[PDB]
Amino acid sequence: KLAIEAPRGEIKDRYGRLLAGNKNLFTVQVSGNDINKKDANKHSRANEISLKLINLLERNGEEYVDEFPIYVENGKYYYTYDRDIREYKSENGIPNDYNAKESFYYLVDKLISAGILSQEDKRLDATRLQAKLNENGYYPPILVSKWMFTAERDKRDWLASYKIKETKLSAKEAFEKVRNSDALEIDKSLSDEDARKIMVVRDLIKSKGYSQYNPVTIAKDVGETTIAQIEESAMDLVGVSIAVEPVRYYPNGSLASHMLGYVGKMPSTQIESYLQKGYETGDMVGLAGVEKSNESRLRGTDGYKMVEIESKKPKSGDTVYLTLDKDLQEVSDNALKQIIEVASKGGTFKSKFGDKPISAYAGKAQSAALIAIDVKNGEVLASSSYPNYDPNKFAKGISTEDYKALQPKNPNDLLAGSPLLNLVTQGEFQPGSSFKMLTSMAALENGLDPNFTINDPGVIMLGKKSFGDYVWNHGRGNHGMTNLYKAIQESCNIYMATIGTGKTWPDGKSIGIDMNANKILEYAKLFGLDQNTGLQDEVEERAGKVPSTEDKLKSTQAFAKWSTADTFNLAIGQGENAYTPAQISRYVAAIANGGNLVELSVVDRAVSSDYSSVKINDQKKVEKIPFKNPDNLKELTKGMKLVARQGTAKSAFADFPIDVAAKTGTAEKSGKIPTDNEYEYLKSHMSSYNVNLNDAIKLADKMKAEKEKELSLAKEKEIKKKLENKDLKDEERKKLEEELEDGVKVRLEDTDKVNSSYLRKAIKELNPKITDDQIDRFKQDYGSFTWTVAFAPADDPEIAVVCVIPQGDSSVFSLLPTREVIGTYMGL
Ligand SMILES: *C(=O)[C@@H](NC(=O)/C(=N/O)c1nsc(N)n1)[C@@H]1NC(C(=O)O)=C(CC2=CCN([C@@H]3CCNC3)C2=O)CS1
Ligand SMILES: [Zn+2]
């Protein structure tokens, strides 16, 4: 009884346009039984056919399967296992010296700094943490049980075959012991160059099947020349034949890359998982997006063949329809490619609705994210991340150059350089001035009269720390006489400060409406901003659960009131808590749809072989936000309409056919993006700081030793005070006593963090004038972004659009995408 693999199902748009599909290639297959067949001859024709075959392909310039885990880089023998380990570490700036356990938790500490995982995620069973990494699209090739790398277990087990119980480490030596193993029996009168072409084919065939099975593939795509060449020379090359094997293709390439996902090799760290699930070794599996989400559905139903006699025919995978409109997704992808392009070296944003001039460097931004949802039912109509990818690079499965060289980037700033990262579900950001409608919604529900106005000072002093409108921080801060509508309209932080705190702050604290942070954070929770969006079981979503009330207490003690200055920040978007575009989308959508919390969906329907369908996304929860008076939202949209026509977004929308509600979020630079190596950065610019390098190293090294001496002593003094405890168990004391004899040598960590902390210290001593800014002068700018959130047509809404350009500074950058995606939707 032999398994047949079903044709993989198709992924289509809401209207039936193909996004993921199949296409047939011509493959070379070798039957390991037939080539190793022996009878009267002393030796199998296996080795000769392997050589013949290859030499044929290398003549036709044809790419072949090479998984043989010893390669020669310019006459030097090396393990591929050994190479993949260090390639992984350098992939995300991990120190080579770092072991399996410290290489894993290092990846964790990065993603935790990037907001993808939380601090409570680290204090967590390591398999549940590998699950969280795995769920977000991270696959560290690390077995958490024995704290070792797959490549090592894989090397030991690969050497175990050919009965090499030697374990003596030598790539040059190992190459031989296998070459003349009882199992291979390769003739010695052949050079290790042509003798290695042999092993590629034999070692492959050996690995895939131990129990007799069906053929193995040695070329996945081969041209007309090498087809007819291998049919006519069939009797010469017994075992070698031409089959057809289907492959994954995405005709629109990079379109909806992140929602769609990719198929590729089964991830090394759970091959046993997939083999008990009934998978072959030579098998492609969805590893991201809907491809993985619906792996079981799209994989279809295996049909056996008897052991030719064809018994049970397979059943093709249900066709899965997304909620994405291709037409709109196209505009959304093209939009964001364009803003990043035109923003670099300057240009014009070309728009159906009026092209705009743009000059360079106002952002210096590499990334972008945008989402568009149906506000009634939470169906996602378009979802674009930049950087993105071609799912096709993976169909065949390149796993060295295209994968390594371009699929990650600088690991000390991954949000702006991870093409596999869906910034829309997985990238959290400080919501800027788009939070304001949450603050205003809280104030309204706690009595606020929208028409109440203030003579805007444009700045609030709180002991020579000044919280001011941007219009103040750049001149005289005044929005003159200012009610809620003008506050939302021109984005007055002073108005929001006053309503968020429930008191008139420049002149004491009174107001008479009773509003605090807890009430704002309440209205955060009500708009589902501490909640997963609905996409998490369909695509990669960063979990949105925010720290609990009792979980925040327990880390404080091992107070809980809100400062005025903090409340001020929280009111206007600045805050501990950061949120993803898809999260905001639900929040703005709730304004647009009259106070309903829609659960987002990307998978619409599946359609079986018998052309019947089912609606996957009709379980989705719509839920009446428990507002005191939902008519309060109509004052938000009254505000957000003025933003479009007269406000912060008139540049884009003022001369736009459709009534658009909108709010802009924008934040300026606040520091610098760290390097992958501080220490070397400081060495590279030692001259530029007017400091001798040798001297600075010799001093930094001195300053360290002096901190150690200091730590060492204060250690000795603690052990000795501890030893004066009258009643101390003898084992306890035998430990402390044995430290003082051989130990009392405290050492610093030897990190980039530590060794570079001390070098910067040495620099400032030998240049007593230089500033941190001047030292950090060469680094990229951190802490800037622009949000545009909008919904339309404002007076009877249908669609919400959220757009973010991180490291961007001009709200033009976010507005114009939003404006295209809304324009397109309404059929203009
Ligand atoms: C809302 O987002 C408000 N922003 C801020 O308070 C911040 N200033 O730094 C902030 N919040 S969180 C963080 N890290 N920083 C006000 N609204 C906005 C808006 O809605 O657009 C304005 C900013 C403004 C517009 C144009 N800007 C750049 C300089 C001029 N050309 C580009 C710009 O910063 C006012 S702040
Ligand atoms: Zn103001």
Tab-separated table of C-alpha atoms in Angstrom, residues 4-12 18-24 245-250 259-267 274 278-280 282-303 314-320 322 391-392 394-396 538 540 603 607-609:
chain	number	residue	atom	x	y	z
A	4	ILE	CA	-0.441	9.349	-3.400
A	5	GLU	CA	-0.134	13.120	-2.595
A	6	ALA	CA	-3.294	15.112	-3.574
A	7	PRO	CA	-3.041	18.296	-5.738
A	8	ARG	CA	-2.587	21.223	-3.266
A	9	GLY	CA	-5.702	23.443	-3.002
A	10	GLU	CA	-5.822	27.009	-4.413
A	11	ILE	CA	-5.983	30.353	-2.509
A	12	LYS	CA	-8.191	32.982	-4.327
A	18	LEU	CA	-6.030	33.175	-8.360
A	19	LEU	CA	-3.386	34.146	-5.741
A	20	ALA	CA	-1.864	30.658	-4.993
A	21	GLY	CA	-1.970	27.819	-7.577
A	22	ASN	CA	-0.056	24.835	-9.052
A	23	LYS	CA	2.022	24.298	-12.249
A	24	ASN	CA	3.782	21.114	-13.547
A	245	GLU	CA	5.917	16.942	-9.987
A	246	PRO	CA	3.646	20.008	-9.358
A	247	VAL	CA	5.101	23.201	-7.726
A	248	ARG	CA	3.576	26.273	-5.996
A	249	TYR	CA	3.175	29.488	-8.080
A	250	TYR	CA	1.738	32.928	-7.154
A	259	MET	CA	-1.483	37.113	4.298
A	260	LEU	CA	-0.773	34.352	1.689
A	261	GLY	CA	2.448	33.062	3.329
A	262	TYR	CA	4.748	30.526	1.557
A	263	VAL	CA	5.323	26.737	1.287
A	264	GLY	CA	8.880	25.309	1.811
A	265	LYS	CA	10.992	22.573	3.555
A	266	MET	CA	9.460	21.039	6.717
A	267	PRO	CA	11.117	22.900	9.647
A	274	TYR	CA	5.101	15.881	10.391
A	278	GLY	CA	1.503	11.188	7.559
A	279	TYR	CA	3.956	13.384	5.561
A	280	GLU	CA	6.859	12.183	3.317
A	282	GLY	CA	10.505	15.114	0.184
A	283	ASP	CA	7.476	17.295	1.122
A	284	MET	CA	6.608	21.039	1.028
A	285	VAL	CA	4.400	22.545	3.804
A	286	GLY	CA	2.956	26.053	4.350
A	287	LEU	CA	5.301	27.827	6.849
A	288	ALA	CA	3.517	31.255	7.019
A	289	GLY	CA	0.123	32.942	6.498
A	290	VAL	CA	-2.929	31.042	5.133
A	291	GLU	CA	-0.611	28.460	3.532
A	292	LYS	CA	0.138	27.148	7.081
A	293	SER	CA	-3.216	28.223	8.676
A	294	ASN	CA	-5.050	25.944	6.149
A	295	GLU	CA	-2.161	23.427	5.580
A	296	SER	CA	-4.524	20.480	6.389
A	297	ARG	CA	-7.369	21.911	4.245
A	298	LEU	CA	-5.185	22.761	1.166
A	299	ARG	CA	-3.080	19.536	1.488
A	300	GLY	CA	-6.284	17.625	0.510
A	301	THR	CA	-6.871	13.834	0.906
A	302	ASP	CA	-4.163	11.197	0.213
A	303	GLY	CA	-5.187	8.267	-2.072
A	314	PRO	CA	-6.606	11.411	-4.358
A	315	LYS	CA	-8.922	14.412	-3.617
A	316	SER	CA	-7.626	17.990	-4.268
A	317	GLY	CA	-7.474	20.500	-1.351
A	318	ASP	CA	-10.560	22.731	-0.886
A	319	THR	CA	-10.064	26.093	-2.656
A	320	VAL	CA	-9.714	28.779	0.084
A	322	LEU	CA	-9.631	35.202	1.085
A	391	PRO	CA	6.417	33.534	-2.068
A	392	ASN	CA	7.830	31.905	-5.312
A	394	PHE	CA	10.281	29.316	-1.704
A	395	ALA	CA	8.127	27.100	-4.039
A	396	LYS	CA	11.296	25.148	-5.126
A	538	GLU	CA	-5.540	32.656	10.264
A	540	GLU	CA	0.834	35.484	12.159
A	603	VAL	CA	-10.263	33.624	5.203
A	607	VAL	CA	-14.970	25.465	-1.832
A	608	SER	CA	-14.685	21.604	-1.972
A	609	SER	CA	-14.104	19.277	-5.048
